[PDB]
Symmetry: D2
Subunit: 488 residues, 4 copies
Amino acid sequence: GSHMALLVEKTTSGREYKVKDMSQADFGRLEIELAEVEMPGLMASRSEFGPSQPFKGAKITGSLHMTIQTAVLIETLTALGAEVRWCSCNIFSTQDHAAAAIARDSAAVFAWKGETLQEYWWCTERALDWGPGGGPDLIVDDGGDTTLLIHEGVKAEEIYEKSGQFPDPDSTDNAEFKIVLSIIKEGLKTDPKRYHKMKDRVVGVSEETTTGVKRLYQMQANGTLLFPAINVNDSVTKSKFDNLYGCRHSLPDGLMRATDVMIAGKVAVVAGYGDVGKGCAAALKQAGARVIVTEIDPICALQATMEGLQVLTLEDVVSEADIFVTTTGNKDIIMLDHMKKMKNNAIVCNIGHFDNEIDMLGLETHPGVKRITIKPQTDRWVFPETNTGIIILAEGRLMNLGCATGHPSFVMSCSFTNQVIAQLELWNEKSSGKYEKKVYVLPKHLDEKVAALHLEKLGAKLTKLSKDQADYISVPVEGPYKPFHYRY
Amino acid sequence: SHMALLVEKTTSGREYKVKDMSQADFGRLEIELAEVEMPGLMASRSEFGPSQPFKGAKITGSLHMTIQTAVLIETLTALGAEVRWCSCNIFSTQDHAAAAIARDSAAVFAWKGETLQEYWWCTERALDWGPGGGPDLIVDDGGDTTLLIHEGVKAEEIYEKSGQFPDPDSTDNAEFKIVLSIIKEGLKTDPKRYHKMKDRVVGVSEETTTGVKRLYQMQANGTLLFPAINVNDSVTKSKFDNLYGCRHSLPDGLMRATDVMIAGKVAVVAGYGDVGKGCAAALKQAGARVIVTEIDPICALQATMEGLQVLTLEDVVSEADIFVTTTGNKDIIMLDHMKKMKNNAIVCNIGHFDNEIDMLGLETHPGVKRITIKPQTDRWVFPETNTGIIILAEGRLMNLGCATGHPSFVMSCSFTNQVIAQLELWNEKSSGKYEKKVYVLPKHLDEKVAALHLEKLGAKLTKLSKDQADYISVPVEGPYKPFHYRY
Amino acid sequence: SHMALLVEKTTSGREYKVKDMSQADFGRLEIELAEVEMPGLMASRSEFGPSQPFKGAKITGSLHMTIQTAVLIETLTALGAEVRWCSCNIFSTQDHAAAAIARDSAAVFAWKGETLQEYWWCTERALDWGPGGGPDLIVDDGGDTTLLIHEGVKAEEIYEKSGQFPDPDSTDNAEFKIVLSIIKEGLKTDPKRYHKMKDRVVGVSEETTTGVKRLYQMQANGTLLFPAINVNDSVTKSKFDNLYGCRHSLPDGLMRATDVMIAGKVAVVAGYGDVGKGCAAALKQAGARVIVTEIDPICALQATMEGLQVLTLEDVVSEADIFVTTTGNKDIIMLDHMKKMKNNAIVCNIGHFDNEIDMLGLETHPGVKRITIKPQTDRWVFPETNTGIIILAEGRLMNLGCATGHPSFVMSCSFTNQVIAQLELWNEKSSGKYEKKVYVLPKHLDEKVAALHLEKLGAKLTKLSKDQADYISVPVEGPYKPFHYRY
Amino acid sequence: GSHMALLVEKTTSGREYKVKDMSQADFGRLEIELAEVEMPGLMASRSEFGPSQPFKGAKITGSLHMTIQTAVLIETLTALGAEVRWCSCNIFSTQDHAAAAIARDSAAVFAWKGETLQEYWWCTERALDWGPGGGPDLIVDDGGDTTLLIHEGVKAEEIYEKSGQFPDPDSTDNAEFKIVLSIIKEGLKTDPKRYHKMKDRVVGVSEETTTGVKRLYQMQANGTLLFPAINVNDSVTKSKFDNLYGCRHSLPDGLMRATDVMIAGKVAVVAGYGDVGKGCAAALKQAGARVIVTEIDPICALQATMEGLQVLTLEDVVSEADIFVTTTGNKDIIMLDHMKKMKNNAIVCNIGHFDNEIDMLGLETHPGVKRITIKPQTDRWVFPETNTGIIILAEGRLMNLGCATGHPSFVMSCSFTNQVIAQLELWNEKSSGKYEKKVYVLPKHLDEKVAALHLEKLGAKLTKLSKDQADYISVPVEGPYKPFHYRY
Ligand SMILES: NC(=O)c1ccc[n+]([C@@H]2O[C@H](COP(=O)([O-])OP(=O)(O)OC[C@H]3O[C@@H](n4cnc5c(N)ncnc54)[C@H](O)[C@@H]3O)[C@@H](O)[C@H]2O)c1
Ligand SMILES: NC(=O)c1ccc[n+]([C@@H]2O[C@H](COP(=O)([O-])OP(=O)(O)OC[C@H]3O[C@@H](n4cnc5c(N)ncnc54)[C@H](O)[C@@H]3O)[C@@H](O)[C@H]2O)c1
Ligand SMILES: Nc1ncnc2[nH]cnc12
């Protein structure tokens, strides 16, 4: 094979991995130990469920961003008896010391910060490739790439089984999808029933993020979804916490690490005002920026105005603003056309799941443009027309994870305790038909439980309803406390 | 009270009972200002006026009888409705609004400072369409009009068979004794009043969380007599009026009633739902240190993320300067709590009903003394301590009781939803689309409400390309969010 | 006006003129509440009451005649002073406060809604200690009482020599014509009134930025007749009342006058000094998008750091919903600006004098029409456009004119400084310590004011060890900051 | 000499330096170029004054923290004709790439991140040691260490000149001062009139920070101050901007980089509520912490309460709080006694100038304590009594600079344009007696000018007074606009 072939390494115990630097394991462990204290829902899950080993025999593939927080999640799964293989769901989001500690101590991990796209897809394939004993039984996904690979893999395998044909990247004009089809092609040479076996064994997927869940609904709508899915993003204790308060923390962190720019006194544009945009706008306003929101949804627009934020189209503000943040989960928000109008050293970043919110393709092909790397994940692109630049963060990829460390532990404990519950539910319920090849959410009493598990850490003292009071508001003393449609 | 509970009539023969008709010109002046602040309602008049969709309809409403409600009423009449109205609280009426409506537009039975007897008499009047019958449609806020009809029908069933009347001795609740006595008296005049009424009612649209709770109870126990639209739980109602409206009107109520500085104080907000979020926001933004009480661990955790301490009432009762109940529950602030409060602690309620605070225990505490500072600000002094507390609006919703409730712009959001709900029920009167259950308006209409309010504020919306719309799986024209989206 | 400008007298012979003495009981009730909120004043009564330091003193004040000022007045009288008072603005009096004071404690000449003639007559009355002479001491807010004395002395000098009177034709300013006519009339009765007065005045303590500006002008031109203490520039005045007080009372004024939703609007704050900072804070915290105008690049830069846009008025005149002038300057919002404003834009002033907004240009605009919505809320409609603007309190300080001004707690800070200033001037009356110049209170007393207000709020101060105190070069007991510290 | 002797290196042009890694110069230049855009007051100073070379012939020693921002300041001094030698005023505050770029391109620099105290004082001595041509003429100081060394050097030289005696570290129990006296002792062997010559030549010092200015007043009060001083800290455009808004930026940056802890939901204690404490409290509250302030000054305490913050003594909250930040400029704020009461993983940091706000001496000698370094400048100290830890940032040294990058460029341009003005004034005015051996502040019209220079960058449009309006408020159309005693 190739001089530069990607090859798995093995620990002294024989577990596969590929990480940046295994010498970083001790440092990873140190920060993991700190995180544990900040993640009471995960630690409570270990205490409650560890002894009964509910995941005994289960094989779990995950793609949550390979951070210290994810490390605590992984080690909760393993504490509960799972065997685990992991990759990151973005080329820039891995924390190398986290990856090293997990590789050393707990799970197969294929992840490093600064992957090429070919490396990224290879790592995804590896995390899914359990070899002859088969697997996974369970998938934890963030953004849907792992789920996509499986669905596209089954499709390719069907064509191969019927007609002998391999995928051909020439068939697509999308550069990344060419890589995907190439991975699949090569994988047919090693195990051309890989994905069919998986299709038959996988109990379900638990999906972390808004973009991933949109993809799940597309597959359900078109009748292609192969196994049950739990939508973790839309737990209240996920969407209304991680997406909002997480970003309120990690947006400014990414800006400050990447650029050190003063936010106070600047004009910042936030495209989108969903959960992520709300948290980003909040951080920016809190820091002393004057925040302008773009929106397509009149309800979200009206919310922004109630918070004292101006709502305009991008075109209205492109020449004036200092910082741009895309939060939409859509595509084509900041185009080359917009970039050409920006002031010198305008900062352009994306915090939505995929980089196509920003027109990186257009930028890279703009005649005469010059990319000057300031430092990793801070790039100044100089427009020749003006001899002025724009500062792109993380090549348009999720800026919080790419330029900083993403969300903090405490809020990730809320998201990831939902993940643990979701995994437990899929595994425990596998032999009714509680779950069809459809998208489900966790029940409210479990959503409430996640919150309840995090109150003591913060010293929050909850009031107990009397029986009379609970009757009066039509709820049980132990909850759930809100109607099905409650929005919080 | 100097009020005689006999209807008056306009020159045209339309009934009313208000405090002072001389206030009508002033009412009109403030309505004229409110119209500019209520573009959703004005847009509704322009869109639907030519077709007069409420031609021939008879509508009873109970929305608080404010300037804002006047604009709603006059939207209904601009669209062809004949209207009778009452307030849903004894202290929430704005007398000038009532006067202008009574004079110009609709039958109104409402004044600020009703007794409970007067309150229930007004409710009966608003429902009394005379021999001809009615209402066709009900607009309710808190469910008292809906309650009266359901309890009336129940009493009429028993009466028809056994001749038994409701007996007020059956309840120790002073206000419910009044309701049972009103039902008894109505049996003695027309034992089928409410049976006939319920058979003619096309539906009710309900404004507020407490009222919608009641509706869901009636649906669950199979007693609900007619379709209901839950207006509260439109996004453009619950996450605007309940939240931002209270953020405005809570401090307004506090300032008018007491003039107390909020900055530097400790304020307790009991509950952290939509109302409690708005109330806590106002207090914190005014420089108070806010402590939240909650039963729901999700809401509690939200409060902590906003930098608020979450404790039980018992932990802070002697420390706090201001107490605000927002729960929609009962028995939040009891006499036992009151007795521990510092001198001149301010106690108020902004939930729908006054039983959040233990007025009964207060009023019956041996040796207690009430000194009225001014209307709706009372200082109660305890004999044990010789210190006092300040109760606002006798525990009734303080924002409406001590100030003017929410402002026009936010009420335009709420009330545009009410227009849409009323139009839906009425247009569908003969179609069988709605069963005797509780419905919410569809998302495209919730979005329309928002969209109607953007121009006023200069908010400029982006349009999706078809490619972008496809990418996120929505139509270019919406709706833009999944059914279970929480905003 | 129905007011007869003839003094009334109490049973005891003390003069007054108020709107309605029947309001005294209500005044008393609200004063009793205010006392609990004003610990600095109450502490002053406890500390100094036994020694009666103002025994035999005659004090004239012009503080706005509110409940808060009533507590100040009754601190002065608790300490032995005899007091005469007027308000320093035509719309700022609270009639119940005035009544209670008139009845119980001091001569008061004040009502809400004075004409300018009445305003100046009240000022003369507050200064009129009869043949015996007085005042010994003046409490001023904005400098009009001080002005009258200085202009009076000037006119008396000319009169004594040439018999010439002030001629109102010498000014085109309608209000200054009233002042010159009052001086003329007083020459015709007692040509040495103000000469005698100035020789007896121990000093003045001045409350507000505009008043202190005037004092510094008089010092600079050598006309200042007596010592003055600048109370405004105590830290515990300027950086509390002017800032936090307006943060409270600006939204109060807006809400009472108009009930408009602030959230979602664009609001312009002209000026970003202490008052503009507080006003902008309130508006932003209420959900308005605030645009600041400024002439001072430091203040402008501060605003930007707070996330506010800084533009000129001309850039935003047609966009903003609410305009608030805070400058202490003149000619901020002119007729030319008004004409460009959207229908029902709200225009108000919270600086000391109404000439921040061009009332004269408005009132004299051909074909303009004023429609009073209610007292202190006027809608002016222009003939060119047939659209209107809403002027609050005819351009007079809106917080006091449309609401109740600042709350008691913050006014206790301001007014404890006034007590200290008055005690200093009076105790030093015969010592020659103060020249005919403007003085500020020393830092240890500024700190004492703060310290007197901490217990109320439960704020617990740390004590320096002697080693720590030495390390930062301060005494354990303070003062804790260098002379030029800005806080 | 010693195997591990600290020795100056020289550039290819012969200029002295000692930095961590000269290969970092290119990276420093890249970030310097970005900073320049964010520092319009400094760049305007270059444009206005560059051609006239006002500092021709002047030698300037500085000790401003050796950051990218300071690099822009240094290169403004050199653009204006100065020769410059520099050190950092804290062992952890240097940005190594900034130091390298300056060393390479513009000035002698003795600075690295992670200096020992002996290295720190050596670098201070080197920055002051111009060799046989003499110098400096001018000093820019932050915290007063450079000024202290000169004053203590003159004292030692007087004793040496009169009585032949050298300093003896045994004479002091203060470990750091032993190092100082040792430096001075050794320096007497190379030039025993170094400091006397300086005393005679130095035109003045411009002092950056509150602690430094307190020291200057002590020397003025005791009649020991040797040369004029300009107090830059107390320009309005310094104290009310850098100390406040700078810390509002850089406090949370330091916490997030050092620990990644979620601030939202926590209890944070801010000791002191001066300018720095106001900005720190603001950041913490803005981020969703519940902030408790400690104060000795009743005015500052009352301010805090008006902002909705609880004011308590440290003892009231030590067992409950999650984060502690000292802001006092005092000493002995957080003692070992307090530390022993803190919860597991409480974060303890200092943002005041000197580390003695926190009882590091007491901590280090606590029986059985164990220091576990998580990563540089994040240390977990484990108390044996409880088997719980506290997290100390930057060994108690200024946490914003030690754990992150300190303040951002834009606000430092305000501080440092004051520095430029101060230096120009001292140099230009040296031959009257405008300036005695006393502490002075810059006049208000120059303070205003600093602000005015930063408005256009932010798009802020200032109104011009009419002549009539300016008369009415008793100010000139061109300012100054406020009375001498105005507090802003
Ligand atoms: N980086 C992180 O740590 C992180 C955390 C959570 C979620 N995510 C991702 O962030 C993205 C947003 O998630 P969310 O939960 O806020 O979704 P959301 O659906 O709640 O909000 C997205 C918003 O974008 C608006 N929008 C869509 N197209 C737009 C356009 N062309 N211009 C302006 N506004 C437009 C929508 O109206 C909507 O309100 C998703 O990709 C999600 O997966 C990232
Ligand atoms: N890290 C940075 O970037 C940075 C920036 C500016 C200033 N500084 C430094 O920060 C420190 C504070 O500066 P400042 O300008 O805020 O000073 P300041 O004098 O304005 O404020 C310090 C405050 O601490 C309070 N205080 C003193 N002793 C106390 C005690 N024992 N407990 C509680 N409070 C106490 C004082 O009352 C005062 O209000 C100084 O050392 C200064 O040099 C650091
Ligand atoms: N102003 C108002 N009018 C009617 N209902 C309301 N509910 C809250 N405020 C109100």
